[PDB]
From TrEMBL, chain G:
From-to range in the entire protein, with total length: 109 to 212 of 477
Protein family according to the UniProt entry: Belongs to the sigma-54 factor family.
Lineage top rank: taxon: Bacteria
Function: Sigma factors are initiation factors that promote the attachment of RNA polymerase to specific initiation sites and are then released.
Protein name: RNA polymerase sigma-54 factor
Taxonomic lineage: Bacteria, Pseudomonadati, Pseudomonadota, Gammaproteobacteria, Enterobacterales
Signal peptide: none
Length: 74, 100, 119, 87, 148, 309, 104, 51, 201, 223
C-alpha cells in the first residue's frame, strides 16, 4: 500500500483539490468505462488513481478536457 | 498461598465468614466433597442432643459479581479438630489464609 | 480577535441610531457608503470587547450560539425579532447535515455561493 | 513546509491547542542586580536637580535598559520616581 | 536480613543472576534480577470489552441506534471528535458520519445497496433528528420553517 | 571443511527415572553453543508425547458437581489425570478402564493393565474416596500428540458425537518440559583444543533421552534439507449446469445456439436493454424465459468477475 | 428517558423488502415487487388474487406472465416459499428446493 | 537527529529513520538487559553525618 | 477496542483483530461474494458468512488489504486524537497500537478502550489517507515540535549501545564499519569498545 | 499430524546486485524460524572456508608509525584497504604476492603479479593511494588458507578475514497457511564480499551444518 502521499501534493499544491480530483477519478475507474493509464499491481482504484495523479498525468484539467471530448464525440 | 505476606490475611479470611469452621467439635468421622460431619467429644457436649455437627458446603453458586463461590474441604479422614479451626476453604483461600 | 467585535457607535453616520453593530458589518457599511456616494457622513465607532461567554451568544445565526449556554432565551429573542440564519456557521451545516465550508468541502461551498448569485 | 492554503479552519486549529495542556494548578526599588555590561538607557526620564552629585527624577514612567554591544537589551528594572542615579 | 536469608538457600546476596536468550543462545550482560511476585487477575477481562456492529436495530425516537452494547449496540461520536475532524478539514467524512452512519432513513439502505453493488457513492438527504427538532419547536407557539 | 571431525554419541548417563544427562564427542569451535540451542529449542517445540484426550464416567454428568463418597471434586480428578504419565505402543487412540471400591487410596497401579500400555509412576493420586459404599468406575482415553492442544481446538471434530456424560480435558503432549545444556573444554590433546557439549534433561519417563535426541536431530536434518536446494526464483461458480432443461418453448433454443450462449452464467449476467439487441424474440417469450431464470437466479441478477473454461 | 428503548423491529414484510432492495430488476419490476410483497400476511401467503394485482398496476403493458415472473423471483427469498397465493404450491416450492437424493 | 532528518531529507526519509531507530532500540533494550536491584542505588555515607 | 503494544507493525499499520473484523466489512464481504460468483443469493452469502468458511476469510483479507481504517481515543483533546492506519488481521481480541503514536493518543497501555471507524465512500478514504494518516502528522499543529519522539526503552537502548566504560574487548581494533556488527555478534569486541578507527563515508 | 512437518516451498530470492540478496521463505512451523535463522547465521559467520590476506612486509620500518616517503597515505589505511581484498586460490596453499607500478598514481589490484591459481574478483580495487612522484614501492604480501575469523593481535599482522561474507541478518514474521495464523516466515539478508553467490553461500552453510549434524541420527531414514 502507499505509505506517504507527497508527490501528488506537490503536483496539486492546494492539498484540498487533490482529494476531489482523486475522488472524481476513482469514481469513474470503479463505475467503469475507463482504463488505468498506470499499470496496476493488484491494488484498488483509490491508490491507482492517486499514483497516476502523483506521476503527473491526471489533474483538474486533463480530466475535464477528456470529459468534454467524450461528450462532444457523442 | 502467598510467599510474602503480612499475617493479617489469616484474620481477614477467618473474619470474612467466607469459609466453614468447626464450632464445638472434637473429631471428624465422615468427609465428603459437600458434607462434613463432626462428632463432638463429651467434654464440650451438653445433654439433650445426639452430639454431632453437620456442615453443608456451597458448591458452584452464582454470586452478585457473576463469579463462582466454591468451598473445598481440608480434613481427609478422622482428624482431631479443635474449636475455632477451619474446615472448608472458600474462594481464593488456602488453609484459612486469604490467597487471591 | 474573536473577543474583539460588536463595536458600539456614538455618531449616527446614517447607518443606524442603535447600539450593537458588528465590526465587519459596520466597516463594510462605511466602505460602501463613504467612498461610493457620500463620504461626509462618517460613522465613528468604539470597539468594546466582550467576554467569551458573552461574545459567543452574539451571532447573526440563531441556530448557532444556542446549545452553548441557553436555548430558550435565544429562541425567544429570535422569535420576537424574526431573524434568518442562512446557514453560514459550521454548527449550522452540522445540524442540517451538509458539507461544512472548510477543508475539502470549501470548494463545494464556494461553488454553491457563486451559483446563488445568478440563480 | 508551505504557507497555509485557503479553506483550512484556523478557528478549529486554534482554541483547541490552548486548552489542550490541561495540566495547570488549582487552589492557588533598591535591589538592582545586573547580568553583564550595560548602559543606562533611561528612556525619557525627566532629569531634575538633586542634593548630591546626581539627577533627581520626577516622572512616574521610568524604564532602564542595558546595552552591551548592540541594540539587544538584558532587562528593564522599572524604578519609581524616588530613584537616584548612581552612575 | 533479606540478604542473610539468601545465603541459607545457596543464592546470591546481591539478587542478580545471569540469563540466556531463548532465541539466540547468547549470554546477557547486566545480570537481570529474578524473583517471585504475587500476581492477581482483575475482572477487567477482554472477553466482555470487545463489541462490534455493522447494522442493527434503531430507535423510534430520533432514529438513533441503541448504544452501549445494549442488544448489539454501537459506539458514540463526540463533540471533541467532530472538532478534531474539522481540524483535519474532512468535510466528506463528516457528512458520511452525519447521514450514512446516522438516523438518515432514506440513506442507509441506499448506501448498503451501493456497497453491496460496489458503487461507493453517498446521498446525504436530511437527518430525521432535525425534523424531530423542528416538530418539537413547532409544538410551542413559535413558527419555524426552511425557505428555498 | 578441512577435517571438521563431526562428533558422535557416547557415554549416555541415567541419573534417575526422570532425569538424565547425555554427552557428545568434541567438535569444532563455535558449534557447541548453536548445536545445544537448536537441540533445546527443537526438543521443547515439537516432540511427540502421550496424554489424555477425553474421560467418561457413569457416576457424574458434568465437571461442576461432586459425587457421593469422594473428597476431591471432578475438576481435581481431571487435573490429576492430566498429569498422569503413561507410555503406549504402536497403535494410538487407546481406552482403558478404572473401577475401584473401598476407602483406601486409589493409585495408578489398580488399573486394568493391557499389553500396550505401561505406567511409569503408579504412585499417582486419583482423588481417593472416603465412604465404604462408594465405588468409582470410569474410562480414560489416552492418545498421542506433538504439541499443546487445548479443549476448544477439538470441539469442531465432535458435533453429533460427544453425548452427555463425556468430559474432555487439556493435553500437553510434552514429556520433557525442562532441559539445559552446557559447553566445556575437555578430552583432546593430539589436536587443537576442542569443545564438548553436555545436555542435562529432566523428562517425565515416557520417552528416552537417546530416542528424543535422535528425533530432534532427524527433524533438524529434514528441516534443513530444504535450504540445500534453493530454487523457485478449485474456486468456481456453483451454478455450472448446462443450458439443457431450461424449457426452450419455440425459438429460445435457436437464439441460444445462434448467439453462442454459454451454459448458465453468461445468460444471467445480461440486462433487458442489452438483451433486446439480440434477434427479436418478443416480449412474451422474454418474460417467459425471465420467469424460468428468476426461479433459480432472482431475475438475472449476477455480475461474475471471471469465467473459467 | 424520552425514547426509553424504542427498538424498531424486523416484521417480515419489512424483511421481504430489505432483499427487494438488493435484488437487481427494473423500475417496473421494483414497482410490481412492492405491490406483491405489500399484499402478504403474517402467515405469509398472499391475500389478493394475482389478477387483482394486475388491476392495482393499472397499466396496459403489464401482463400476467410478467407478474408470474417478478413474483416467482421473490417467491424463493426468506424464508422459503412465502407469498404462496394458496398453499398446495407453497408446499411444492419447499419440496422443490432440497436434493433428489432423499427417498420418497 | 529526527528533526534534522525531517528538515533536510524529507518526510519519508525521517519516517523510515524513526522506524529503524525504534526497531534498533527494541532490539538493544532487550539485548542489554537493563536490570534493577537494591544494591543498584547507593546511599551516601556522609548522610549520617549531615543529619 | 482494547489497545496493546505494536513492536512490529510499523507506523502506517494497525492490528485489527479478525474477531472484530469480518463484521464491520460485512456489506463489503457480501459484495465480494456476489462479484466472485460464490453466492447467487443474499441469503446464501449470509449463510456462508455466519459459518465462517475459509473463502470468507480469504475474501476478508483481499478486501481489507487496500482499505484504511481510523482510530480515535475516547478522551480527545487535540487534533491528533483521531488518526488513520492500515488494518492488519491479528488472531486476538485487542487492537495493537503503534508505540510512537501512543504519545499522540496519550495512552499508557493500562486498561483503556479505543474507538474504530471504517470509511465507506472513496472521498472519506482519500481524506483519511491524505490528511489523517500517522505518516503525515509528524510536527505538532500547536508549537511546531515533532510529535513522534522516542522516550521509552528505545532511548535507553541507544544510550547503552552508544557508550564506552574505559575500553572494552578489542580496543586497538580497526575496521571499516560494516565489520562492527560482524565482530560484535560472534566474537572480537563489544558495543562499549572505544578507540575504534573506521572509515565513514 | 503425528510427525508431519511443513517444508518451505516458496524460496523466491530477489537481489539488487551481485553481492546483495534478500531471500524469503514460506510460513514455517512454530519456533523453527528463529532457530533456523540463528543457526544458519552463526554457521555462516563463525566458520566458513575461504581465502584472505594475512600479513604484508613493506620496505621500511616494521613499526606502524612509519613515514609516507612518497605514498602520501599512512600504512594503517593501506592495510585497511588491503583487508577489503577478496583473493581466490584454486588449490594452492599459503602463497606470496608482490607488486610494482610506475608513478601515475592509481594503484589497483592489477598491479599485483598474476599467478596460476591466484585470482582477484575486482581488478579496480584500490590498494595504495595516489603517489606524488615516480617512486615505486614493494608490498610483499602473503595469503593463507583458513576458515572463520581471527584477529591479528593473537594470531599474526594485518588481519585474517577468512569468512567470505560481509554482513548477515535474519527476521521472522507472522503468517498463516489456511486458518491458523501462528506460523513463522523467515527472511534472510546477507551482503557478500564477493567470489561467492549469496544463495551458493547459504547452500554451502546448510550442507556444512548437515554434514556436522548427520552423525547424530546414526544413519536414520534408510527407507
Amino acid at each position: 500500500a502507499r505509505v506517504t502521499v507527497q508527490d501528488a501534493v506537490e503536483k496539486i499544491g492546494n492539498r484540498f483539490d487533490l482529494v476531489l480530483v482523486a475522488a472524481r477519478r476513482a469514481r469513474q475507474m470503479q463505475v467503469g468505462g475507463k482504463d488505468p493509464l498506470v499499470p496496476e499491481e493488484n491494488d484498488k482504484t483509490t491508490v491507482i488513481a492517486l499514483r497516476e495523479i502523483e506521476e503527473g498525468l491526471i489533474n483538474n484539467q486533463i480530466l475535464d478536457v477528456r470529459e468534454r471530448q467524450e461528450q462532444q464525440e457523442q | 498461598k502467598p510467599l510474602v505476606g503480612t499475617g493479617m490475611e489469616r484474620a481477614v479470611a477467618v473474619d470474612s465468614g467466607v469459609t466453614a469452621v468447626a464450632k464445638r467439635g472434637g473429631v471428624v468421622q465422615y468427609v465428603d466433597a459437600s458434607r462434613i460431619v463432626i462428632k463432638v467429644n463429651e467434654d464440650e457436649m451438653y445433654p439433650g442432643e445426639a452430639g454431632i455437627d453437620i456442615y453443608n458446603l456451597t458448591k458452584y453458586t452464582r454470586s452478585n459479581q457473576n463469579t463462582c463461590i466454591n468451598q473445598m474441604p481440608c480434613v481427609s479422614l478422622g482428624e482431631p479438630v479443635e474449636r475455632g479451626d477451619v474446615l472448608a476453604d472458600g474462594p481464593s483461600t488456602d488453609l484459612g489464609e486469604l490467597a487471591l | 480577535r474573536q473577543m474583539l467585535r460588536k463595536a458600539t457607535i456614538v455618531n449616527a453616520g446614517s447607518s443606524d441610531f442603535l447600539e450593537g453593530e458588528q465590526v465587519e458589518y459596520s466597516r463594510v457599511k462605511i466602505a460602501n457608503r463613504e467612498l461610493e456616494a457620500n463620504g461626509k457622513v462618517g460613522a465613528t465607532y468604539s470597539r468594546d470587547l466582550l467576554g467569551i461567554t458573552k461574545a459567543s451568544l452574539a451571532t447573526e445565526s440563531f441556530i448557532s450560539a444556542a446549545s452553548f449556554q441557553e436555548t430558550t432565551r435565544v429562541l425567544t429573542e429570535a422569535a420576537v425579532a424574526g431573524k434568518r440564519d442562512e446557514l453560514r456557521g459550521l454548527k449550522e451545516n452540522v445540524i442540517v447535515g451538509r458539507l461544512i465550508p472548510a477543508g475539502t468541502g470549501y470548494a463545494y461551498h464556494q461553488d454553491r455561493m457563486r451559483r446563488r448569485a445568478a440563480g | 513546509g508551505h504557507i497555509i492554503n485557503k479553506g483550512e479552519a484556523i478557528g478549529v486549529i486554534a482554541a483547541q491547542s490552548i486548552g489542550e495542556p490541561g495540566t495547570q494548578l488549582t487552589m492557588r526599588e533598591s535591589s538592582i542586580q545586573v547580568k553583564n555590561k550595560g548602559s543606562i538607557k533611561l528612556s525619557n526620564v525627566k532629569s531634575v536637580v538633586n542634593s548630591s552629585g546626581k539627577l533627581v527624577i520626577t516622572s512616574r514612567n521610568t524604564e532602564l535598559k542595558l546595552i552591551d554591544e548592540f541594540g539587544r537589551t538584558k532587562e528593564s528594572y522599572k524604578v519609581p520616581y524616588g530613584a537616584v542615579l548612581a552612575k | 536480613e533479606i540478604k542473610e536469608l539468601l545465603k541459607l538457600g545457596d543464592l546470591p546476596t546481591s539478587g542478580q543472576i545471569r540469563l540466556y536468550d531463548g532465541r539466540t543462545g547468547e549470554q546477557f550482560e547486566r545480570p537481570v534480577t529474578v524473583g517471585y511476585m504475587y500476581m492477581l487477575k482483575l475482572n477487567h477481562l477482554v472477553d466482555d470489552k470487545m463489541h462490534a456492529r455493522s447494522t442493527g436495530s434503531y430507535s423510534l425516537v430520533t432514529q438513533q441506534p441503541l448504544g452501549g452494547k445494549a442488544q448489539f449496540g454501537g459506539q458514540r461520536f463526540g463533540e471533541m471528535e467532530v472538532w478534531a475532524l474539522e481540524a483535519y478539514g474532512a468535510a466528506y467524512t463528516l457528512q458520511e458520519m452525519l447521514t450514512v452512519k446516522s438516523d438518515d432513513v432514506n440513506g442507509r439502505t441506499k448506501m448498503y445497496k451501493n456497497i453491496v453493488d460496489g458503487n461507493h457513492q453517498m446521498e446525504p438527504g436530511m437527518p430525521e433528528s432535525f425534523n424531530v427538532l423542528l416538530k418539537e419547536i413547532r409544538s410551542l407557539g413559535i413558527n419555524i420553517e426552511l425557505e428555498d | 571443511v578441512t577435517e571438521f571431525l563431526k562428533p558422535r554419541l557416547v557415554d549416555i548417563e541415567q541419573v534417575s527415572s526422570t532425569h538424565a544427562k547425555v554427552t557428545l564427542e568434541p567438535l569444532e569451535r563455535g558449534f557447541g553453543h548453536t548445536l545445544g540451542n537448536a537441540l533445546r529449542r527443537i526438543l521443547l517445540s515439537s516432540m511427540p508425547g502421550c496424554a489424555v484426550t477425553e474421560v467418561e464416567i457413569d457416576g457424574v454428568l458434568h465437571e461442576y458437581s461432586t459425587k457421593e463418597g469422594v473428597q476431591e471434586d471432578i475438576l481435581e480428578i481431571l487435573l490429576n489425570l492430566k498429569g498422569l504419565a503413561v507410555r503406549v505402543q504402536g497403535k494410538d487412540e487407546v481406552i482403558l478402564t478404572l473401577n475401584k471400591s473401598g476407602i483406601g487410596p486409589v493409585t495408578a497401579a489398580d488399573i486394568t493393565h493391557d499389553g500396550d500400555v505401561e505406567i511409569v509412576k503408579p504412585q499417582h493420586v486419583i482423588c481417593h474416596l472416603t465412604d465404604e459404599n462408594a465405588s468409582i468406575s470410569m474410562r480414560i482415553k489416552v492418545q498421542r500428540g506433538r504439541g499443546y492442544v487445548p479443549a476448544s481446538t477439538r470441539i469442531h471434530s465432535e458435533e453429533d458425537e460427544r453425548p452427555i456424560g463425556r468430559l474432555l480435558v487439556d493435553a500437553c503432549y510434552s514429556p520433557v518440559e525442562r532441559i539445559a545444556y552446557n559447553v566445556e573444554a575437555a578430552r583432546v590433546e593430539q589436536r587443537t583444543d576442542l569443545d564438548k557439549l553436555v545436555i542435562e534433561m529432566e523428562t517425565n519417563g515416557t520417552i528416552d533421552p537417546e530416542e528424543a535426541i535422535r528425533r530432534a536431530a532427524t527433524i533438524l536434518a529434514e528441516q534443513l534439507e530444504a535450504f540445500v536446494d534453493l530454487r523457485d526464483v478449485e474456486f468456481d461458480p456453483i451454478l455450472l449446469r448446462p443450458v439443457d432443461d431450461l424449457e426452450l418453448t419455440v425459438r429460445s433454443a435457436n437464439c441460444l445456439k445462434a448467439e453462442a450462449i454459454h451454459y448458465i452464467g453468461d445468460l444471467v449476467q445480461r440486462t433487458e436493454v442489452e438483451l433486446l439487441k439480440t434477434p427479436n424474440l418478443g416480449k412474451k417469450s422474454l418474460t417467459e424465459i425471465k420467469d424460468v431464470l428468476a426461479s433459480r437466479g432472482l431475475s438475472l441478477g449476477m455480475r461474475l468477475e471471471n469465467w473459467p473454461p | 428517558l424520552p425514547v426509553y428503548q424504542g427498538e424498531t423491529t424486523q416484521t417480515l414484510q419489512d424483511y421481504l423488502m430489505w432483499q427487494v432492495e438488493l435484488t437487481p430488476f427494473t423500475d417496473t419490476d421494483r414497482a410490481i415487487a412492492t405491490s406483491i410483497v405489500d399484499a402478504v400476511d403474517d402467515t405469509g401467503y398472499l391475500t389478493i388474487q394475482i389478477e387483482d394485482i394486475v388491476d392495482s398496476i393499472g397499466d396496459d403493458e403489464i401482463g400476467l406472465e410478467e407478474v408470474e415472473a417478478v413474483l416467482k423471483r421473490i417467491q424463493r427469498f426468506d424464508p422459503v416459499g412465502v407469498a404462496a397465493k394458496d398453499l398446495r404450491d407453497c408446499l411444492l416450492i419447499q419440496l422443490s428446493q432440497f436434493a433428489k437424493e432423499t427417498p420418497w | 537527529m529526527l528533526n534534522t532528518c525531517y528538515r533536510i531529507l524529507g518526510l519519508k526519509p525521517t519516517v523510515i529513520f524513526a522506524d529503524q531507530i525504534m526497531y534498533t532500540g527494541f532490539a538493544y533494550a532487550a539485548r542489554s538487559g537493563a536490570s534493577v536491584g537494591i544494591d543498584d542505588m547507593v546511599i551516601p555515607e556522609k548522610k549520617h553525618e549531615i543529619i | 477496542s482494547v489497545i496493546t503494544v505494536g513492536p512490529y507493525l510499523r507506523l502506517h499499520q494497525c492490528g485489527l483483530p479478525k474477531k472484530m473484523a469480518l463484521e464491520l466489512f460485512k456489506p463489503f464481504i457480501y459484495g465480494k461474494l456476489e462479484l466472485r460468483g460464490l453466492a447467487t443469493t443474499i441469503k446464501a452469502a449470509k449463510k456462508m458468512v455466519e459459518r465462517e468458511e475459509a473463502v470468507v476469510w480469504d475474501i476478508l483479507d483481499e478486501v481489507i488489504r487496500e482499505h484504511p481504517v481510523l482510530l480515535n481515543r475516547a478522551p480527545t483533546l487535540h487534533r491528533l486524537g483521531i488518526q488513520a492506519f492500515e488494518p492488519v488481521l491479528i488472531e486476538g481480541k485487542a487492537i495493537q497500537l503503534h508505540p510512537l503514536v501512543c504519545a499522540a493518543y496519550n495512552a499508557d497501555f493500562d486498561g483503556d478502550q479505543m474507538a474504530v471507524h471504517v470509511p465507506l465512500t472513496l472521498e472519506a478514504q482519500l481524506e483519511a489517507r491524505a490528511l489523517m494518516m500517522s505518516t503525515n502528522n509528524i510536527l505538532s499543529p500547536a508549537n511546531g515540535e515533532p510529535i513522534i519522539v522516542p522516550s521509552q526503552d528505545v532511548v535507553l537502548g541507544l544510550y547503552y549501545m552508544t557508550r564506552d566504560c574505559v575500553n572494552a574487548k578489542g580496543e586497538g581494533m580497526v575496521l571499516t564499519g560494516p565489520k562492527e556488527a560482524e565482530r560484535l555478534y560472534r566474537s572480537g569486541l563489544a558495543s562499549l569498545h572505544a578507540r575504534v578507527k573506521v572509515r565513514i563515508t
